[PDB]
Amino acid sequence: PQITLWKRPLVTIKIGGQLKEALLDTGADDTVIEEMSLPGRWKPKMIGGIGGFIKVRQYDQIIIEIAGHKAIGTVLVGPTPVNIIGRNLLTQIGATLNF
């Protein structure tokens, strides 16, 4: 699709069999999701946003559907205010910015 930006570019994602809402976010290097259970081991990561840095749990090679497109990649889990799909998965679904 071609998504305009008059409203938040919210899509449905599927992770762990559950549907969630998430923001397509070209200003996010990484994908960050609210607290949830994911399988496997995790590694520590600190990410820096507008208000400062937070600690998150990094899960690699997680299967996630984004707006009907399949991706498998790194998902960070932590106290983000909204679920954000960052460039690491936007590139896997073939997203570009166009003007």
Q: Site residues (CB under 6 A) for ligand 065?
A: 23, 25, 27-30, 32, 47-50, 81-82, 84, 86
Give the interface size with Na ion as a residue count (CB under 5 A).
3
With contact defined as beta carbons under 8 Å apart, do 22 and 10 qualify?
A: yes
Are 59 and 78 a contacting pair, CB within 8 Å?
A: no
- Dist. CA 47–CA 29, nearest whole Å: 9
Q: Is 25 a catalytic residue?
A: yes
Q: Which of 2, 61, 96, 98 binds Na ion (CB under 5 A)?
A: 61
User: Which residue number, 21 or 29, has a Cβ lying nearer to ligand 065?
Assistant: 29
- Largest pairwise CA distance in the chain: 40
Give me the least distance between CB of 85 and its own copies, in Å please: 9
Instruction: Report the candidate in 10, 28, 8 with the shortest Cα–Cα distance to residue 67.
Output: 10
Candidate residues 9, 20, 45, 73; the one interacting with its own copies per rule CB under 8 A: 9
Q: Does 60 bind Na ion (CB under 5 A)?
A: yes
Mind telling me the catalytic residues? 25
